[PDB]
Each structure stands twice: as structure tokens, then as C-alpha cells.
Ligand binder design. Structure first.
Ligand code: MG
Ligand code: MG
Ligand code: MG
Ligand code: MG
Ligand code: MG
Ligand code: MG
Ligand code: ZN
Lengths: 154, 127, 148, 81, 150, 181
RNA sequence: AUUCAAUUGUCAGAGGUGAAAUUCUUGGAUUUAUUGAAGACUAACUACUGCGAAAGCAUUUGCCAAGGACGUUUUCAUUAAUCAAGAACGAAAGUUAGGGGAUCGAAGAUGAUCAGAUACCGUCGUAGUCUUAACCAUAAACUAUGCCGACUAGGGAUCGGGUGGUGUUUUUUUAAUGACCCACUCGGCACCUUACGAGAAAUCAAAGUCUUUGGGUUCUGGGGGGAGUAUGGUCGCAAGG
RNA sequence: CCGUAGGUGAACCUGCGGAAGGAUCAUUA
């Protein structure tokens, strides 16, 4: 949350000079194929352009918030990168049907279909449907699921 | 002749319960905690609090008129320890000291056949 | 003992189960003998469903030199077969009043003692603990006959 | 025990040891000539007879295999060799 | 010794010193070999002819009261089996444990014992092929082993 | 107005019972004024009172506590300290309750609480006003709460596998501000 | 036993603690009593011990095949011993896809605190822990001691089998056995004394039979790092081997 | 300490399974 305080504020400043710990500065500058790669790497790498100057152990790092902010909702992206970054070494299909992840996700889906009014069937996922298998269908539909969290891009 | 009560002493590391009713657990008669008798938090399970609490239970049993009493004592049981702590022993000393008649002293601690995992992990739990 | 019926501030009470005190079991288990547990699932003549747990052991004889008296596993299986047969025929040949009337003078473990003396010397035999499992359709006159 | 006869041991201590550890290896078995009284005939039975040897006329089990030695029938006579 | 194991047990038949016939024995050699052949028409394997010969008839060993072993006077009559006894019993034991492991596919100990039994069958097949009392084109397969048993 | 309590005699301690029973019973019978009856066959001791005795109801509980003390390995000088004082109580605890140990781990934990010639046991009786008896899997400490509480901290240091030198340092630290106050 | 649910009684706490603090309690918490459901687990009996090639294996009963040891006046007659290549198994944690998910619980969310005796502490807790199908092939996988064979010490034991007793007990009327005792006997788990002998010593019935140096055979090491690193190969979805 | 996994870390902690390469006193048969 050290960079979260300067990623979403109103009236973003010109520059940002600051000293942090060096390993978080490695997390903001981590390549996607690394074990040092994390969620906050993606958070800076499409919300806050960042590079390392003035190595002090501590590190100085420089941040700039992109004033044409790309239209990505932070809540859903933050939640999905959290639930695929906590299970970093695991895959993505079986990790969602966890115990209580598989309550809160279809709570988010039922609020997501509250303005859509989609009919929830009696088929609903334990054999072939939305709590269990349509999640697998829509991760098959995109670039995720089999490619792990240390390989997927933005 | 007399009327016997059914007594329970529950001895944790951090309090004591002196809790008694009549036969078959019908309706609870006297009910004390370690926290209500000494307001110091370091002395919740003190033997002083145990004897004063059991003395107040004995006063409750005397004003309802029960003279004899049957007692069983226990720890938490299960994954934690089996025999009661010394707060229970001081409670026994207090209830015998109170002049109330005692009927039977046993140890109904809930003992597992085969327990589950305790709340410490591999390394250990106490300090 | 379980309470069932009211007779003017006086209460009828029925049989529910038997147990020992736990300190009896704590003293009672020896570190140098073999413990036998035998269990049988029981339906009774008076339509109760019951569970009987009997415990048997291994003695020192009067001539022993051995500091431990263990038993082989086929011996243990034979004694467990014998305890299951004695308990099964004993509870089938009787009803609840005769079960209580044979619990008090220790007739059952005497039958164990002289019926297992051909297999192994056995000591400190008692049924430890009595469970009711199924209660039938509720009667009235049989319970006052038990009271009478 | 610096010196003792390994050629002529004392015969009390010689058959006292194992079957195979003697100076010449000998069996510790014998043969039993058994007489059941019902038919009166000589039957030569091994002392460690490992099968249910019946009599040739009556169906009487002369010996049952019980581990080492075969136990003979009750009320039945036997002789050595 | 005691291969495919770790035991060191010695438990075996001793043999008496006397290479001649015992004095208390009163039966003739032609009588005992006709006894052997009438036990042979019942189809028993030569260990059981020896055992029932030892127990009910009191014969010391086969090699002393006639000059031959048991299959010398069994292929003299030509009733010898086409495969030897112990190798046939190893096939029977192998197909029995193969029946058990096709029943139960999670028994690892039965699988490892199958490997040990198969090694013993390979070694005895090598030895009996070497002396050529077994044809040299004989190879084990498990299905043909089940065919030879059944 | 009689009262009798029933208590169990261990087999491991019935031979010092018949050895030092002549030193056991006359101090309590004279000074504490009770009645004792044996049952040597059924491992039971009858501690009984009578209206012909003195009216003291708590010393019957105390006498059952002396025989409960003697049940668990305890000598007679701690029975004299239990005669004279009231703050002194008894405890059991298990080796498996701190840490799951098995076999030689259990043996090394018993060796750690025992020590070379019982010297860490000596260091924990003298510096804390406690008294130590080791069972096969049970630890037994007598005394008052300020005493036995720092005995708890020491023994759950030691049975966790902490070295006895850190036990000695923490032991003399807690003994130092024990005798300081 | 634990957790949760239902019913029951009663009143200011319960929880956790070097200490406090969070958590949830008039809809009565902890606790008491009557039941139910879930999944793990097989305590005390448990060592002076058992089995398995090893990892490992503790409820009862039935079935399925397997194994050691012993007995054997059975059977075969060298069919043997050790092992590159190759193959089977391989604790925990990990990986895929299912079922279950009670307890515990790395991540995370939370509180703290107050001192340099100090953060171990708490409460939710996802993964997992459990099972099925398939992978993975590492450990302080330890007896830190290759496997087979012979010799060089006894004795107190014990486990499994066998032999013998005008031995004991168990009675019914004497047996039979079953259990116990004695003298052995093989074959295991171990102990205690030595020293003939070894070693640098600790110590050792093997770590002896080795300068008086040869029973057969498999693998590994050549001062310490660089470094299990670089690179190549190989297997694996990957972590990695 | 070892093996595995994870948060990290200026160090280091924690989950599961192993080892002592870690110190048996007293008591009794
Ligand atoms: Mg071999
Ligand atoms: Mg040999
Ligand atoms: Mg190789
Ligand atoms: Mg290795
Ligand atoms: Mg080098
Ligand atoms: Mg070293
Ligand atoms: Zn006949």
C-alpha cells in the first residue's frame, strides 16, 4: 500500500521523488517471467511509469501517474490479480473453486448480473455450469488458465 | 436426609468456573467467574479469587439450603491438558472449608479416544 | 438413569446407562499386560438396541518368572470371539430387568472366567459401559411394572 | 578350553546340540509302528508325518500333522523303528 | 543366503549316514516301484510321491532301496511332466498373484512381489533351458503362462 | 457427622508406603487429628473423620491432598511444608502437550528436564521454591503461584528444546527479581 | 474428542496473554444438560517389543493373494554371490483434474504493545492437511557403518517355531490341551563385561582375523574455496531432479 | 539443522515431515 497512496489520488502531481526499501523497488521493476513479479508490478506497469535512479539498503524510485488514465476498473482487476497472485505457483482453474472464494466470486457475479437479470439455473455449477465449469469455459476463452501467473501479460 | 447438589469445577490456565445445579442439570443455581470477584486482570485465576468465588457459591447454596454436594472436576480436555489446574484445587479446599457437606469427588474430564491437531503447530505453543 | 413419568411431585425414573469413573480406568490399565476390547451390536428381547463394551486381560499365574505376560494375536482373537458369543447369548436370553439383575452380582464375567479358562488366564473382567441406541414405541404399564 | 577332543565328544553332550551341528549330521527322527486295535495290523508311520495318514482298512486318522511331531491317536499303541 | 529376502535360516532335511537299506525295512524294490507308479497314475508331483511314500509306507528315501532317483524311475515309465515341478509351481503362484493384482490395482507390495517371483521364473527358465530338459525356444509370457495353467 | 474419602494407591509407590508408613501416619494422627484405615488388597486408603475428632473440615481436604501428593512421587518433607503452609498446591502436565515428540525425542526431553546428575533439576528446585518429580510422561511441581508460574516458564522453555544454559540465565534472572522483592 | 446446528437453564462476563489489547455477548455469550451432522484420527494398553526391501506400519470383523522363521530317514542338483545398462517402490511438502473440506493452518486481512529480557501473542483464515486418477523422485531417507561367506567371547534376557519332563496349574474322575516353569535348540530386536585385536582417540563381537599386508564383488574420495556454479545433455506441465 | 513450500529480508520469519550432529535425576521390579 506504499505506492497505492500515490496511484489514485485526485490532482496528481508533476513528479514523485521518494526513498523506499530496495526490494519493493524490485517489485515495481519486475519482469513478468520472474519470481520477483507481483500484482503491484502490473499496477505500476499500466498505471504509473516508473524507473530506478539513485541507489542508496534502500532505493530511490521515481513515479509518474499517466494523466490519460486507461479505462480499467481497479476493483475487479485488483481482485482477480489478488486471487491469481496468492496462488502464484498454482494454476487458475482449480484455484477459484476454493472454499470461500467459491462463495464470494459468485456473490460478485450475482451482483454483476443484478443489473443484467440473467436467469440462474438449477444446473448451477457442480457438474457443468456457472459456479464450477463456465468459469473454466471463460478462462479457456481468454489467454489465461493454463498459462500461469508468471507468464500472463496485461 | 439431606439434599445433594451436582457441582462442576472448570479449571483453565486463565480463570476458574464454580458452577452447580441439582440433579440431571435441570436449572443452574449458582454461577461465578474468575473475572467478577477480582477486578485485576492479572488475578483472574488466582486461588484468592477461587476461594472467594467458591465461598460465594457456598453462600448461595446455603441460602437455597443445599448442604450435601457431589463434585466432578475437569480441565479443558481434548487437545489441551487433562488434569485440572490449582484453581480447582483451591476451589475444593474452599468448598470443604465452607462447612458444606461433600458427597463424591471424581474427575469427569472429556477424554478423547484419539484427538485432532492442537493449536500450536509443529514447533510448540507455550513461550 | 432417565426420568419419564410424574406421580404428584414424585418422578418415575428408567434405566439409561452405566459407566465407570475415569480414574478407575486410569488406575486400571497396566503397563505390562495385554488389553482386550470386545464390542457387540445388540438387539434385545424387549426390542431395545444396545451396545456392550467388555474388557478382559492377561494374568500372572502363581508360578511366573516373566516380568511381562503378553498374549499372541490368535489368542486375543479367540478370547474376543468368546466374549462376543457370551455377551450375545446372554443379552438375547434375557430382558432389561434380568440385565440389571445380572449386572450387580458379576455373573457375566464369572461366565467369562470359567468359559475362557481353557484359552488364557484372564483378570479384572467387567463390562465397562452401557449405551442405549434405539428407544421403541412408548409404553406405560411395563414401566410401572418395572416400578412395581 | 584350550584343549578338548573334537574327535570323541561325550555322547551326553553330543546329541544335546542341533541336528545339523553334530560331527556327522544325523536326523533326530524315528519311525513309529502303530497298532490301532480295530483291525490289528502293522503300519509304519513317520514320527513327523506331515499328512493325515489313515489306516488301509478302517478310516481312522492315525496321526495328524501338528508342526514338529505328528500326534498319534488316543488309545493306540506304538513301537520304535 | 536366502535370496529375494534377508533371512539367514537353516532348516532342512538331514540325511543319515547309512547308504544301504535299513534293517527294519522289509519291502522289495519291485513292490515299491509299482507303488510309485500307481501313485503316479493319480497325477501327483514327485514331492508328494516322496512324502506319501515317507509317511504311510516308511520308506527312508527313494535313492537307497532302489538305485535311482524319483524321476529316473518316473521317465523309465515315461510319466514325467513336460515342464519341471518347481517352475510349474512358480507359474501357478505367478498367475495367482496376477489374478490378485488384476483384482486390486493399488496393492504395491503385491506388485513388487510379482517382480521378485518373475525374477525367479526367469532364473529357473535360464537354468532348465541350459540343461535342455526344456526346449530352447521357450520364453515366458504372462498370457501363455495363464494358458499353461488353465 | 462422619466423612470418608477414597483414594488410589499406585503400585510403584506401595513399597515406600510400607517402608515409611511408620513415619507417615503419627504426625497427621497426632497434630492433624484424623483416622486412617487401609485396604491393601484393593489399593485404597480410608481417610475418615468423627465428631469425636476436632471440628476442622478443611484439614480432611488437606489430608486427601497429602495422600494425593504421595500418589505422585512426593517425599515427606514436602508433606511437612504442606502441613505448615496453605499456598502450596500440586500440578501435572504432559510432555506431548507442548510439542509432539516420539520415542528418542521423548527420551531426550526427559534428559533435558533431568540433566547430568539431576543438576538442572537441582537448579530448578533451589532457585524457585519448587520441588521436582519426573514421571515417564508427567512433570510434577509443588508450590505457590508466583513460584510455580516461573517454574512453568522454565519448564516450557526446557521441554521445547531450548538449551539449559539459556534456562540457567533466565532462571537466575527470575530468581534475582524473585528474591529482590 | 473437536467444530457447527437444534432444544434447555441462568446471569456480567467469556477470549487470550511477560503483561495488556483487540473478538462477541439481553436477539442470554462462556458454561450446564438432551440430541443430530461432518470429516480426520486410532491415546492410555506401548516396551525390557513385532512386521516389511526401504519409505513406513497400532479399532473390530470378513475376503483376497503374499512373507519370514521352524519341522522335514520330502523334491531339483550348482540352478550361486555382487552389480554399469534397464526397471519397481520411494516420508513430508509440491503439480494437474475430481469428491470432501471437521480440526490445524505458510499467504493475506486484522489488532497491538513497550520496552531495548522481547516479539514469540490473538482472531479470521485461502492453499493445503483427507481421498480418487496421474505426476514429482528429494530429506539429518541415519545404524551418520555396502552385500554375500567363514572364524575369534560368554551370560541375563526377550519375540516366532520345535524337542524333552513319573514339572506345576487349570477338574470332571484321571486325561487331553490352554497357560506357567525348567534344560536346550535354531532364527530375529537389543543389553553388560572385557581385549586377544583394531583405531588418532571417542569407542568397536565388528570399526577384529591388515607391514606377519590377498575369501568374492559394487560404488565413492584425493587440501580448502570458486561451486553443485557456468555450459552441454537428459526427464518433467512447472517447481525442479 | 535437513527436505519442501511461502511472505519476504539490511537481516530473516512461518507451514508440514524427519535427525540429534542435545545433558537420565529420583523412584521401582
Ligand atoms: Mg541377490
Ligand atoms: Mg546361511
Ligand atoms: Mg546404476
Ligand atoms: Mg541424495
Ligand atoms: Mg579441490
Ligand atoms: Mg560434520
Ligand atoms: Zn486300522
Amino acid at each position: 500500500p506504499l505506492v497505492f497512496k500515490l496511484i489514485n489520488q485526485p490532482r496528481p502531481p508533476r513528479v514523485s521523488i521518494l526513498m523506499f526499501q530496495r526490494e519493493f523497488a524490485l517489485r515495481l521493476l519486475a519482469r513478468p517471467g520472474d519470481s520477483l513479479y507481483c500484482r503491484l508490478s502490473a499496477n505500476v506497469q499500466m498505471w504509473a511509469n516508473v524507473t530506478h535512479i539513485m541507489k542508496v539498503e534502500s532505493s530511490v524510485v521515481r513515479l509518474e501517474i499517466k494523466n490519460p488514465r486507461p479505462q480499467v476498473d481497479y476493483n475487479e482487476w485488483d481482485g482477480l490479480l489478488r486471487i491469481v497472485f496468492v496462488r502464484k505457483n498454482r494454476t487458475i482453474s482449480a484455484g477459484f473453486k476454493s472454499t470461500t472464494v467459491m462463495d464470494i466470486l459468485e456473490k460478485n457475479y450475482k451482483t454483476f448480473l443484478a443489473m443484467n437479470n440473467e436467469m440462474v439455473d438449477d444446473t448451477k455449477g457442480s457438474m457443468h455450469d456457472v459456479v464450477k465449469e463456465k468459469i473454466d469455459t471463460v478462462l479457456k476463452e481468454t489467454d489465461l488458465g493454463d498459462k500461469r501467473a508468471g507468464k500472463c501479460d496485461q | 436426609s439431606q439434599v445433594f447438589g451436582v457441582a462442576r469445577i472448570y479449571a483453565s490456565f486463565n480463570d476458574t468456573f464454580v458452577h452447580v445445579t441439582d440433579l440431571s442439570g435441570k436449572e443452574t443455581i449458582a454461577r461465578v467467574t474468575g473475572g467478577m470477584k477480582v477486578k485485576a486482570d492479572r488475578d483472574e485465576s488466582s486461588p484468592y479469587a477461587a476461594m472467594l468465588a467458591a465461598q460465594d457459591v457456598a453462600a448461595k447454596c446455603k441460602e437455597v439450603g443445599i448442604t450435601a454436594v457431589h463434585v466432578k472436576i475437569r480441565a479443558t480436555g481434548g487437545t489441551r491438558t487433562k488434569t485440572p489446574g490449582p484453581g480447582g484445587q483451591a476451589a475444593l479446599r474452599a468448598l470443604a472449608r465452607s462447612g458444606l457437606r461433600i458427597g463424591r469427588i471424581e474427575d469427569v474430564t472429556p477424554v478423547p479416544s484419539d484427538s485432532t491437531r492442537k493449536k500450536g503447530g509443529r514447533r510448540g505453543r507455550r513461550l | 438413569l432417565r426420568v419419564d413419568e410424574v406421580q404428584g411431585k414424585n418422578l418415575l425414573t428408567n434405566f439409561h446407562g452405566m459407566d465407570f469413573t475415569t480414574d478407575k480406568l486410569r488406575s486400571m490399565v497396566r503397563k505390562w499386560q495385554t488389553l482386550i476390547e470386545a464390542n457387540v451390536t445388540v438387539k434385545t428381547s424387549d426390542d431395545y438396541v444396545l451396545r456392550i463394551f467388555a474388557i478382559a486381560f492377561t494374568r500372572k499365574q502363581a508360578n511366573q518368572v516373566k516380568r511381562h505376560s503378553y498374549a499372541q494375536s490368535s489368542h486375543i482373537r479367540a478370547i474376543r470371539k468368546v466374549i462376543s458369543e457370551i455377551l450375545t447369548k446372554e443379552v438375547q436370553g434375557s430382558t432389561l430387568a434380568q440385565l440389571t439383575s445380572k449386572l450387580i452380582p458379576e455373573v457375566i464375567n464369572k461366565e467369562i472366567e470359567n468359559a475362557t479358562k481353557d484359552i488364557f488366564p484372564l483378570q479384572n473382567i467387567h463390562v465397562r459401559k452401557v449405551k442405549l441406541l434405539k428407544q421403541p414405541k412408548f409404553d406405560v404399564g411395563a414401566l410401572m411394572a418395572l416400578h412395581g | 578350553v584350550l584343549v578338548q577332543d573334537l574327535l570323541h565328544p561325550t555322547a551326553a553332550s553330543e546329541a544335546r546340540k542341533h541336528k545339523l551341528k553334530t560331527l556327522v549330521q544325523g536326523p533326530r527322527s524315528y519311525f513309529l509302528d502303530v497298532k490301532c486295535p480295530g483291525c490289528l495290523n502293522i503300519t509304519t508311520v513317520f514320527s513327523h508325518a506331515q499328512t493325515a495318514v489313515t489306516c488301509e482298512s478302517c478310516s481312522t486318522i492315525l496321526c495328524t500333522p501338528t508342526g514338529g511331531k505328528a500326534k498319534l491317536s488316543e488309545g493306540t499303541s506304538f513301537r520304535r523303528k | 543366503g536366502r535370496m529375494h529376502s534377508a533371512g539367514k535360516g537353516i532348516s532342512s532335511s538331514a540325511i543319515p549316514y547309512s547308504r544301504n537299506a535299513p534293517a527294519w525295512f522289509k519291502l522289495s524294490s519291485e513292490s515299491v516301484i509299482e507303488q510309485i507308479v500307481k501313485y503316479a497314475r493319480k497325477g501327483l508331483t514327485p514331492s508328494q510321491i516322496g512324502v506319501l511314500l515317507r509317511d504311510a509306507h516308511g520308506v527312508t528315501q527313494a535313492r537307497v532301496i532302489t538305485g535311482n532317483k524319483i524321476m529316473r524311475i518316473l521317465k523309465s515309465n515315461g510319466l514325467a511332466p513336460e515342464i519341471p515341478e518347481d517352475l510349474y509351481y512358480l507359474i501357478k503362484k505367478a498367475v495367482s498373484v496376477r489374478k490378485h493384482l488384476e483384482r486390486n490395482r493399488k496393492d504395491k507390495d503385491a506388485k513388487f512381489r510379482l517382480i521378485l517371483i518373475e525374477s525367479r521364473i526367469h532364473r529357473l527358465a535360464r537354468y532348465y533351458r541350459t540343461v535342455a530338459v526344456l526346449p530352447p525356444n521357450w520364453k515366458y509370457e504372462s498370457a501363455t503362462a495363464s494358458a499353461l495353467v488353465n | 457427622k462422619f466423612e470418608s474419602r477414597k483414594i488410589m494407591v499406585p503400585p510403584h509407590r506401595m513399597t515406600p508406603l510400607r517402608n515409611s508408613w511408620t513415619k507417615i501416619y503419627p504426625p497427621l494422627v497426632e497434630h492433624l487429628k484424623l483416622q486412617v484405615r487401609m485396604n491393601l488388597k484393593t489399593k485404597s486408603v480410608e481417610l475418615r473423620t468423627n465428631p469425636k475428632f476436632t471440628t476442622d473440615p478443611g484439614a480432611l481436604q488437606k489430608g486427601a491432598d497429602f495422600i494425593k501428593a504421595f500418589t505422585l512421587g512426593f517425599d515427606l518433607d514436602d508433606s511437612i511444608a504442606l502441613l505448615r503452609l496453605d499456598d502450596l498446591y500440586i500440578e501435572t502436565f504432559e510432555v506431548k502437550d507442548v510439542k509432539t515428540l516420539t520415542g528418542d525425542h521423548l527420551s531426550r526431553a526427559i534428559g533435558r528436564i533431568a540433566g547430568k546428575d539431576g543438576k538442572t533439576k537441582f537448579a530448578i528446585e533451589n532457585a524457585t521454591r519448587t520441588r521436582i518429580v519426573l514421571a515417564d510422561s508427567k512433570i510434577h511441581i509443588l508450590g505457590g503461584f508466583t513460584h510455580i508460574r516461573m517454574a512453568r516458564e522454565s519448564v516450557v522453555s526446557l521441554i521445547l528444546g531450548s538449551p539449559p544454559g539459556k534456562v540457567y540465565g533466565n532462571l537466575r534472572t527470575v530468581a534475582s527479581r524473585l528474591k529482590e522483592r
